[model samples]
Every structure is written in C-alpha cells, then in structure tokens.
Target: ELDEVDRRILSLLHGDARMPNNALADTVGIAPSTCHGRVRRLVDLGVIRGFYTDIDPVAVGLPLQAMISVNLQSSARGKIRSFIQQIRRKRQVMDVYFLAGADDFILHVAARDTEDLRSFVVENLNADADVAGTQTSLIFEHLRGAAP
Candidate 1:
C-alpha cells in the first residue's frame, strides 16, 4: 500500500541508513516533514526493520568466512533446543538457521584463518553429541555495490 514517495524513501534509506532527513527529502522530491513522517510510519509498520553497519571482516582480522551445514542425529524438540542454545554461546558463529532438507542446521562462521575455523568446528560444533556430520564451504569474496 505504499506510494511512489514511500518507495523512494525506502530505496534511499536502504542505501544509506545514516542519510540525513533533508538529503532524503531532497532526493525523494518531498518536503522534509513529509519525508520524516513517511519514514516513521514505515518503521512503525515494520517495513523498515532495522539498521546496521556493514563492516569489512578482513579489516577486523576476521578474513575467513565459511558456511557450515550440519546434520543432527535426532530431530527431537528438546535436543534441537539444547543444540541451538549451545550454538548461541559460540562467538565465532555469526548467523545460524534451521534447514528444511538434508541438513538440520546451517551456520555462517567467521574466523582469523583456516586453523581457527578448524579448531572451532572440532572443539565447538562437532563436540556436541547431537551433531552427526558437517559440510563447510569457505567464502572467497563478496561483491556488492554501494547504494544509488
């Protein structure tokens, strides 16, 4: 139910979450007050979920990124809950999700190097008795342009 102005506001905000209200209004060709109201409404409606800074992992000494697909020995609710709780405590795990097909869970992990990743997989993820098997794919690059 959004109008063209709303769409423009969203596009601008997505590109630069820190965009000033006046600049957003100028880019979207609307009054500053109107633009501000639209943005507030969008947030209230759950259209604009949240904002985050996109930091370079390499710059932060976390150059290695890997996706790990995990297969669990059991799908019991209690076991799954316990496994998720344990994963939440691991600092190297950036993101985690429950999967639909062969893999019971997937995790996006970042570390300083291959050795660190290996150690984490062995000592943290695989150490759990419920973990059956895991397949990992390392990410070599990320290509995404800045907002328009």
Candidate 2:
C-alpha cells in the first residue's frame, strides 16, 4: 500500500509532471532525497507512467475525430494481436480498445476531413477480410474529468 506522503507526491506530480524535485518535496513535507527516491520507486513499480505532450489535432490538420466500433469476422478471433498491431501503425489511430461484447474493438481516430474518414473506413475496415462490419460516429466535443 502507498503511504499518504507517497500518494500526495503522486497527486502533485500528476498535476504538474515538470514540477521541480525540491518544490515537490517541500509541498509533500518530505526531504528532497526521500521524494526523489520515492519518485524513482513509483516509476520502477510502473505506478507513474511516462509524461506525454497534449498535441492539438486541429493544429495538425486533423480536425475531425471519430469513434469507430469494429466487429471482426469469426475467422479473425485468433488474430487479435496482429489486427491491433496493424491498426496501431496508422497515423490517424489515436487509441484502440479490445472489448467483450458485440463489437470486437473500438478505435479513436482523427482525420483531415469527412473524405479522409470515408477513405479510412473504406480502405482500412471495409476492404479487410477480417473485419465484418463497422460503425463510425463523429465526435462533436470531448471533455476530460476525474483528476486529482
């Protein structure tokens, strides 16, 4: 179990990953060395994932975002990993989720425009023998919640 001091360090670090080690340690009321050591331990335990940049899709010319639900054919059940690998290589793909329901997986993607979305669906999913069907829904707005 994580101690209160360690959890506080994690919470503060999550809010501002670039916070100085001394500042974080002072905020958590701990020695700088202890804070530094705890941070390293968190990383080693896989509790603290790598920091990432928040890139703007609109600024990159990919203004359109869509969530596509994909259903794989029966013959493709054994090829899930390969299917994920193939989808992961696409520039439009932001994330993919494996499911346990009617749909085999879902893809969060960004595209240049409607034409690009159409082309992606037609060329990637429709043309693939492994894909049985797909339902693409355009995202009007997205918001993030649940941060500490």
- Count of steric clashes across candidates, in order: 0, 0
Runs with alpha carbons beyond 4 Å of true place in candidate 2: 31-37, 57-60
What are the per-residue Cα lDDT tens digits for candidate 2 across 2-69? 99998999899888878999999999999999999999999998988766667764537888888888
Clashing pairs in 2: none
Error in Å for residue 89 of model 1: 5.8
Residues 52-104 of candidate 1 have per-residue lDDT tens digits of 77778553888888888877666454687777787878888877888778888
Report how far off residue 36 is in candidate 1 (Å). Answer: 3.9
